[PDB]
């Protein structure tokens, strides 16, 4: 009965369920992530919706369903984001840092504002300031994996595909702080406009610092460490997964920023300690780790959607949700528009500039992915409280697990089509 | 309080502590596993023996101390015994199949009896024959990793470094079946003489078959699968950890044999399906997964040894244990002698033969490692029953820990000395 070994079964099944998808969806427009999400939705519906006795597979599903709200993050978010923070070049980022900062930081502090105000004034589900701008902050998070999987699959400029790539790998570093502050306000405090500057001074501003400290320590150690690849590969794990803990748990910060700045430093200086025997292996190991984390997140996020919304069709049958996710879809398009527009003055005059075709390609390339789903899971799995309740934590996940599907399918197919029409 | 995320601390702690040892104990005779075991003993003594509140480290110790038996054996053993199975040279093995068989199968079916008889007739712990042959059949397991570390550390041969290498690689596949049958007999079965033949006909004999089936299916898929290194590595993980589950949990077999036969099949028939891009990545990834598993096992089996023997110094203060592990050591040495000698007639007449120097090096080199420690740890995590009490399982773990400590602190240094003394 729910034997712990059954959990390994999930690791043995989801992965292959991912692998087949990656085999069955290679040249097709639809990525494997949406296939994983729909498979997870169907499996969860068969497990909790119909309550069919499924077996040891069901035992594994029920084991990973009770994944702890922050253990989920500690296992998957560093895994999801160290590949992206690590597999980025520095030569093409020192030429566009100004254009990335003013596409990521004021690219999310306005993106959250717009599409959060719209849902605050439009959703009749009896929401608030904090619990609606929390959704605004979490869902304005673009996958740094799907964007690269489109900007390398589809031929594009080496500098445009640099903008679309360097945008996401700070969107998911400043959409997790415009997430955590509103989550903290919703859960255990109030709208304190005096301690926001304290929260943003501890988190981020010390997360990056502790990440840099761990990075310099690890690079010194690696320079001291002689020729042994398996020591270095496991030391990357022993520093990332440990600095994440020392940040979130021992400093109350956002350890995701710690694991991302570790990748920042490594990619900046992966030539003084790492040898040529390790570049070809570590960049293959961490992409596989991110692939595993992405598969598990996109399938367990379908399982949890089915657990929450398909208990007794409590939310699925309601018409206040199915016709309102498309409303947030047009809201996120409007948010992307009002993010590119209000920044274009300082965007085209900084870094590399932006042509009209380049601008219209940057829009419709904002692919939502595993980070928004992971944060929605981190809220739904931490629901049931007085303020954050079953009608809100589950609604975050219902909204995100449909919007990430829509952005990854329709917004990808139409982006490919408009790229084909708009010759470049 | 005992937050699950604290488990990552342990993953973040051991994985750096081992990296310390492997860095410091690089050119020293004693391996890093001894340092890991002594560190684990120290931490367990500090948290249980003295009940010192370490803090979140103590919570991590406690989250990785209720590890369930067949979750202990479903995460580490398939990982601890796939690096060696996969990294097997078959061209040098097809010339010694008979010599490997008549060092593994009758190499353990005799060495189990020789140890079990002496411990049964000498240990005053009121030990049944089944639970004494259990120790005799689980302690006759030599890890491939330590023996290959010694035989590649310094000057050796190609007809010796392969015989000891193919020795351990099946000693920890027939010290698993001579372990599980004794454990099953002690748990809830009798001494029926048809039960043993049924058990051997089903288990390891359907395990090899299912491992071959999974291997051929995976190789067909790889032949279908185009150039994707990360897909291939993920498929290797999702076939090893999933075939183990399908064997142990869906067929009652010993999946530890299934993962090993998958490794053998990959080493033999799967070197052209994998491209040259993958032969440098899988051999760098699995040598690190096994490194992680070996680092976790040698410290987990220090913490659990401490919690079993340092509760209230229930067993440590007893003089029936601290002077009886050396009796087990001399029994191990005698068993090694009487297993090389009895087989020497047909051993030197098949394969590469065996000179007197080669014979005296094959004996006296029976390095006990993490495979016996893991089995004793699984037994202790299954203790508390009427047939085997908590005292019996703790005694198993203590005896195996002492044997693996001794054979890795002394049997290696003395072998290094006697190879230069005996003009190798």
PDB file of C-alpha atoms in Angstrom, chain A residues 230-401:
ATOM      1  CA  UNK A 230      33.333  12.842 -12.180  1.00  0.00           C
ATOM      2  CA  UNK A 231      34.490  14.953  -9.242  1.00  0.00           C
ATOM      3  CA  UNK A 232      33.641  18.184 -11.076  1.00  0.00           C
ATOM      4  CA  UNK A 233      30.276  17.022 -12.428  1.00  0.00           C
ATOM      5  CA  UNK A 234      29.106  15.971  -8.970  1.00  0.00           C
ATOM      6  CA  UNK A 235      30.591  19.113  -7.423  1.00  0.00           C
ATOM      7  CA  UNK A 236      28.290  21.163  -9.639  1.00  0.00           C
ATOM      8  CA  UNK A 237      25.396  19.265  -8.031  1.00  0.00           C
ATOM      9  CA  UNK A 238      26.910  19.545  -4.550  1.00  0.00           C
ATOM     10  CA  UNK A 239      27.187  23.330  -4.936  1.00  0.00           C
ATOM     11  CA  UNK A 240      23.918  24.100  -6.753  1.00  0.00           C
ATOM     12  CA  UNK A 241      21.573  21.921  -4.690  1.00  0.00           C
ATOM     13  CA  UNK A 242      23.394  22.974  -1.502  1.00  0.00           C
ATOM     14  CA  UNK A 243      23.527  26.719  -2.193  1.00  0.00           C
ATOM     15  CA  UNK A 244      19.817  26.585  -2.980  1.00  0.00           C
ATOM     16  CA  UNK A 245      19.227  25.163   0.498  1.00  0.00           C
ATOM     17  CA  UNK A 246      21.609  27.576   2.232  1.00  0.00           C
ATOM     18  CA  UNK A 247      19.756  30.443   0.535  1.00  0.00           C
ATOM     19  CA  UNK A 248      16.078  29.549   0.879  1.00  0.00           C
ATOM     20  CA  UNK A 249      16.320  27.737   4.215  1.00  0.00           C
ATOM     21  CA  UNK A 250      19.260  29.348   6.049  1.00  0.00           C
ATOM     22  CA  UNK A 251      18.731  32.874   4.688  1.00  0.00           C
ATOM     23  CA  UNK A 252      15.030  33.137   3.796  1.00  0.00           C
ATOM     24  CA  UNK A 253      15.962  34.350   0.316  1.00  0.00           C
ATOM     25  CA  UNK A 254      14.909  33.015  -3.094  1.00  0.00           C
ATOM     26  CA  UNK A 255      17.430  30.247  -3.678  1.00  0.00           C
ATOM     27  CA  UNK A 256      16.397  30.058  -7.327  1.00  0.00           C
ATOM     28  CA  UNK A 257      18.334  33.283  -7.799  1.00  0.00           C
ATOM     29  CA  UNK A 258      21.268  31.595  -6.061  1.00  0.00           C
ATOM     30  CA  UNK A 259      21.236  28.631  -8.458  1.00  0.00           C
ATOM     31  CA  UNK A 260      20.845  30.981 -11.431  1.00  0.00           C
ATOM     32  CA  UNK A 261      23.725  33.254 -10.432  1.00  0.00           C
ATOM     33  CA  UNK A 262      25.850  30.143  -9.911  1.00  0.00           C
ATOM     34  CA  UNK A 263      25.142  29.275 -13.537  1.00  0.00           C
ATOM     35  CA  UNK A 264      25.861  32.890 -14.475  1.00  0.00           C
ATOM     36  CA  UNK A 265      29.305  32.754 -12.872  1.00  0.00           C
ATOM     37  CA  UNK A 266      30.074  29.301 -14.274  1.00  0.00           C
ATOM     38  CA  UNK A 267      29.187  30.272 -17.844  1.00  0.00           C
ATOM     39  CA  UNK A 268      31.185  33.476 -17.358  1.00  0.00           C
ATOM     40  CA  UNK A 269      34.278  31.554 -16.218  1.00  0.00           C
ATOM     41  CA  UNK A 270      34.012  27.984 -17.528  1.00  0.00           C
ATOM     42  CA  UNK A 271      37.533  28.208 -18.944  1.00  0.00           C
ATOM     43  CA  UNK A 272      39.906  28.611 -15.964  1.00  0.00           C
ATOM     44  CA  UNK A 273      38.897  25.542 -13.924  1.00  0.00           C
ATOM     45  CA  UNK A 274      36.813  23.276 -16.159  1.00  0.00           C
ATOM     46  CA  UNK A 275      38.903  21.451 -18.757  1.00  0.00           C
ATOM     47  CA  UNK A 276      38.030  20.516 -22.319  1.00  0.00           C
ATOM     48  CA  UNK A 277      37.328  16.977 -21.132  1.00  0.00           C
ATOM     49  CA  UNK A 278      34.508  18.331 -18.948  1.00  0.00           C
ATOM     50  CA  UNK A 279      32.806  20.873 -21.234  1.00  0.00           C
ATOM     51  CA  UNK A 280      31.461  18.178 -23.566  1.00  0.00           C
ATOM     52  CA  UNK A 281      30.212  16.045 -20.646  1.00  0.00           C
ATOM     53  CA  UNK A 282      28.826  18.582 -18.168  1.00  0.00           C
ATOM     54  CA  UNK A 283      26.817  20.428 -20.838  1.00  0.00           C
ATOM     55  CA  UNK A 284      25.384  17.010 -21.737  1.00  0.00           C
ATOM     56  CA  UNK A 285      24.635  16.041 -18.130  1.00  0.00           C
ATOM     57  CA  UNK A 286      22.878  19.255 -17.128  1.00  0.00           C
ATOM     58  CA  UNK A 287      20.726  19.344 -20.258  1.00  0.00           C
ATOM     59  CA  UNK A 288      19.609  15.810 -19.367  1.00  0.00           C
ATOM     60  CA  UNK A 289      18.901  16.912 -15.780  1.00  0.00           C
ATOM     61  CA  UNK A 290      16.834  19.842 -17.045  1.00  0.00           C
ATOM     62  CA  UNK A 291      15.042  17.489 -19.443  1.00  0.00           C
ATOM     63  CA  UNK A 292      14.148  15.135 -16.583  1.00  0.00           C
ATOM     64  CA  UNK A 293      12.977  18.031 -14.411  1.00  0.00           C
ATOM     65  CA  UNK A 294      10.919  19.470 -17.276  1.00  0.00           C
ATOM     66  CA  UNK A 295       9.259  16.112 -17.958  1.00  0.00           C
ATOM     67  CA  UNK A 296       8.462  15.508 -14.289  1.00  0.00           C
ATOM     68  CA  UNK A 297       7.155  19.062 -13.826  1.00  0.00           C
ATOM     69  CA  UNK A 298       4.964  18.938 -16.940  1.00  0.00           C
ATOM     70  CA  UNK A 299       3.450  15.550 -16.019  1.00  0.00           C
ATOM     71  CA  UNK A 300       3.088  16.055 -12.259  1.00  0.00           C
ATOM     72  CA  UNK A 301       1.515  19.426 -13.062  1.00  0.00           C
ATOM     73  CA  UNK A 302      -1.145  17.572 -15.027  1.00  0.00           C
ATOM     74  CA  UNK A 303      -1.602  15.097 -12.208  1.00  0.00           C
ATOM     75  CA  UNK A 304      -2.080  17.913  -9.689  1.00  0.00           C
ATOM     76  CA  UNK A 305      -4.507  19.753 -11.997  1.00  0.00           C
ATOM     77  CA  UNK A 306      -6.567  16.581 -12.099  1.00  0.00           C
ATOM     78  CA  UNK A 307      -6.315  16.177  -8.316  1.00  0.00           C
ATOM     79  CA  UNK A 308      -7.520  19.724  -7.691  1.00  0.00           C
ATOM     80  CA  UNK A 309     -10.120  20.368 -10.375  1.00  0.00           C
ATOM     81  CA  UNK A 310     -11.366  16.786 -10.894  1.00  0.00           C
ATOM     82  CA  UNK A 311     -12.118  15.734  -7.314  1.00  0.00           C
ATOM     83  CA  UNK A 312     -15.845  15.635  -8.114  1.00  0.00           C
ATOM     84  CA  UNK A 313     -15.682  17.941 -11.145  1.00  0.00           C
ATOM     85  CA  UNK A 314     -15.766  20.735  -8.573  1.00  0.00           C
ATOM     86  CA  UNK A 315     -14.091  23.289 -10.852  1.00  0.00           C
ATOM     87  CA  UNK A 316     -14.110  21.670 -14.319  1.00  0.00           C
ATOM     88  CA  UNK A 317     -17.883  21.872 -14.802  1.00  0.00           C
ATOM     89  CA  UNK A 318     -17.948  25.522 -13.705  1.00  0.00           C
ATOM     90  CA  UNK A 319     -18.266  27.945 -16.607  1.00  0.00           C
ATOM     91  CA  UNK A 320     -16.429  30.679 -14.693  1.00  0.00           C
ATOM     92  CA  UNK A 321     -13.042  29.084 -15.488  1.00  0.00           C
ATOM     93  CA  UNK A 322     -13.079  27.533 -18.977  1.00  0.00           C
ATOM     94  CA  UNK A 323     -14.134  30.762 -20.722  1.00  0.00           C
ATOM     95  CA  UNK A 324     -11.890  32.917 -18.499  1.00  0.00           C
ATOM     96  CA  UNK A 325      -8.501  31.348 -19.272  1.00  0.00           C
ATOM     97  CA  UNK A 326      -8.823  32.699 -22.819  1.00  0.00           C
ATOM     98  CA  UNK A 327      -9.518  36.055 -21.177  1.00  0.00           C
ATOM     99  CA  UNK A 328      -6.174  35.831 -19.401  1.00  0.00           C
ATOM    100  CA  UNK A 329      -4.698  34.754 -22.753  1.00  0.00           C
ATOM    101  CA  UNK A 330      -5.772  37.972 -24.451  1.00  0.00           C
ATOM    102  CA  UNK A 331      -4.600  39.734 -21.281  1.00  0.00           C
ATOM    103  CA  UNK A 332      -1.104  38.268 -21.599  1.00  0.00           C
ATOM    104  CA  UNK A 333      -0.974  39.273 -25.265  1.00  0.00           C
ATOM    105  CA  UNK A 334      -1.946  42.816 -24.251  1.00  0.00           C
ATOM    106  CA  UNK A 335       0.666  42.679 -21.485  1.00  0.00           C
ATOM    107  CA  UNK A 336       3.370  41.656 -23.954  1.00  0.00           C
ATOM    108  CA  UNK A 337       2.290  44.520 -26.216  1.00  0.00           C
ATOM    109  CA  UNK A 338       2.366  47.112 -23.429  1.00  0.00           C
ATOM    110  CA  UNK A 339       5.710  45.726 -22.261  1.00  0.00           C
ATOM    111  CA  UNK A 340       7.407  46.067 -25.646  1.00  0.00           C
ATOM    112  CA  UNK A 341       5.754  49.428 -26.393  1.00  0.00           C
ATOM    113  CA  UNK A 342       6.542  51.381 -23.223  1.00  0.00           C
ATOM    114  CA  UNK A 343      10.130  50.122 -23.382  1.00  0.00           C
ATOM    115  CA  UNK A 344      10.846  50.522 -27.135  1.00  0.00           C
ATOM    116  CA  UNK A 345      12.166  54.121 -26.650  1.00  0.00           C
ATOM    117  CA  UNK A 346      14.976  52.783 -24.447  1.00  0.00           C
ATOM    118  CA  UNK A 347      15.047  49.418 -26.236  1.00  0.00           C
ATOM    119  CA  UNK A 348      15.896  50.402 -29.812  1.00  0.00           C
ATOM    120  CA  UNK A 349      18.465  52.946 -28.547  1.00  0.00           C
ATOM    121  CA  UNK A 350      20.232  50.441 -26.274  1.00  0.00           C
ATOM    122  CA  UNK A 351      22.271  47.347 -27.038  1.00  0.00           C
ATOM    123  CA  UNK A 352      21.477  46.138 -30.555  1.00  0.00           C
ATOM    124  CA  UNK A 353      18.232  47.963 -31.232  1.00  0.00           C
ATOM    125  CA  UNK A 354      15.020  46.453 -32.528  1.00  0.00           C
ATOM    126  CA  UNK A 355      13.522  46.484 -36.030  1.00  0.00           C
ATOM    127  CA  UNK A 356       9.765  46.245 -36.645  1.00  0.00           C
ATOM    128  CA  UNK A 357       9.998  42.597 -37.717  1.00  0.00           C
ATOM    129  CA  UNK A 358      12.297  41.943 -34.755  1.00  0.00           C
ATOM    130  CA  UNK A 359       9.780  43.594 -32.425  1.00  0.00           C
ATOM    131  CA  UNK A 360       6.825  41.624 -33.817  1.00  0.00           C
ATOM    132  CA  UNK A 361       8.863  38.427 -33.482  1.00  0.00           C
ATOM    133  CA  UNK A 362       9.805  39.211 -29.869  1.00  0.00           C
ATOM    134  CA  UNK A 363       6.075  39.497 -29.266  1.00  0.00           C
ATOM    135  CA  UNK A 364       4.426  36.101 -29.805  1.00  0.00           C
ATOM    136  CA  UNK A 365       7.704  34.680 -28.443  1.00  0.00           C
ATOM    137  CA  UNK A 366       7.067  34.763 -24.699  1.00  0.00           C
ATOM    138  CA  UNK A 367       6.545  31.040 -24.260  1.00  0.00           C
ATOM    139  CA  UNK A 368       5.185  30.133 -20.842  1.00  0.00           C
ATOM    140  CA  UNK A 369       6.690  26.937 -19.507  1.00  0.00           C
ATOM    141  CA  UNK A 370       7.842  24.908 -16.557  1.00  0.00           C
ATOM    142  CA  UNK A 371       8.608  27.792 -14.194  1.00  0.00           C
ATOM    143  CA  UNK A 372       5.052  29.164 -14.152  1.00  0.00           C
ATOM    144  CA  UNK A 373       3.681  25.640 -13.691  1.00  0.00           C
ATOM    145  CA  UNK A 374       6.186  24.937 -10.914  1.00  0.00           C
ATOM    146  CA  UNK A 375       5.169  28.099  -9.069  1.00  0.00           C
ATOM    147  CA  UNK A 376       1.477  27.282  -9.525  1.00  0.00           C
ATOM    148  CA  UNK A 377       2.179  23.854  -8.021  1.00  0.00           C
ATOM    149  CA  UNK A 378       4.132  25.490  -5.188  1.00  0.00           C
ATOM    150  CA  UNK A 379       1.001  27.514  -4.402  1.00  0.00           C
ATOM    151  CA  UNK A 380      -1.656  24.806  -4.926  1.00  0.00           C
ATOM    152  CA  UNK A 381       0.290  22.258  -2.874  1.00  0.00           C
ATOM    153  CA  UNK A 382       0.568  24.934  -0.156  1.00  0.00           C
ATOM    154  CA  UNK A 383      -3.138  25.828  -0.251  1.00  0.00           C
ATOM    155  CA  UNK A 384      -5.852  25.109   2.319  1.00  0.00           C
ATOM    156  CA  UNK A 385      -4.981  28.053   4.573  1.00  0.00           C
ATOM    157  CA  UNK A 386      -7.377  30.791   5.661  1.00  0.00           C
ATOM    158  CA  UNK A 387      -6.201  33.322   3.065  1.00  0.00           C
ATOM    159  CA  UNK A 388      -4.859  31.012   0.347  1.00  0.00           C
ATOM    160  CA  UNK A 389      -7.645  28.444   0.014  1.00  0.00           C
ATOM    161  CA  UNK A 390      -8.676  25.510  -2.161  1.00  0.00           C
ATOM    162  CA  UNK A 391     -10.641  27.853  -4.452  1.00  0.00           C
ATOM    163  CA  UNK A 392      -7.527  29.967  -5.129  1.00  0.00           C
ATOM    164  CA  UNK A 393      -4.479  27.698  -4.994  1.00  0.00           C
ATOM    165  CA  UNK A 394      -6.222  25.292  -7.356  1.00  0.00           C
ATOM    166  CA  UNK A 395      -7.374  28.152  -9.594  1.00  0.00           C
ATOM    167  CA  UNK A 396      -3.773  29.307 -10.023  1.00  0.00           C
ATOM    168  CA  UNK A 397      -2.916  25.865 -11.326  1.00  0.00           C
ATOM    169  CA  UNK A 398      -6.005  25.569 -13.528  1.00  0.00           C
ATOM    170  CA  UNK A 399      -5.200  28.919 -15.131  1.00  0.00           C
ATOM    171  CA  UNK A 400      -1.487  28.226 -15.590  1.00  0.00           C
ATOM    172  CA  UNK A 401      -1.878  24.626 -16.783  1.00  0.00           C
TER     173      UNK A 401
END
